[PDB]
Amino acid sequence: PSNVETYEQILQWVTEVLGNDIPHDLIIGTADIFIRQLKENGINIDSLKFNELVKLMKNI
């Protein structure tokens, strides 16, 4: 319930730019690739949403 809730709204951005019609296996890769290396380290509105969600939950 902790990391399941916050993860869903990240995929709303992925469906808008690329498309919801892409495969589910491709969305898992697109979701993981952004979250992995921004943590460890209309484009403006989407980046502001992403940085708050990277802050939440455990990730290395």
Phi and psi based region of residue 22 (left: phi greater than 0; alpha: psi -120 to 50; beta: remaining) = beta
* Angle at alpha carbon of residue 48, lines to 40 and 32, rounded to 5°: 40
Tokens of 56: 């939440």
The first and second tokens of residue 37, run together, are 């290396």
Q: What number of residues does the chain have?
A: 60
The CA-based dihedral angle spanning residues 33, 39, 42, 48, taken in that order and rounded to the nearest 10 degrees: 150
Report the alpha-carbon distance of residue 6 to residue 31 in Å, rounded: 13
Method used experimentally: X-ray
Give kind and range of the element (H or E) at residue 13.
helix 2-14
**At how many Å resolution was this determined?**
3.4
State how far the Cα of 38 lies from the Cα of 51, in Å rounded to an integer: 8
The Cα diameter of the chain in Å comes to 31
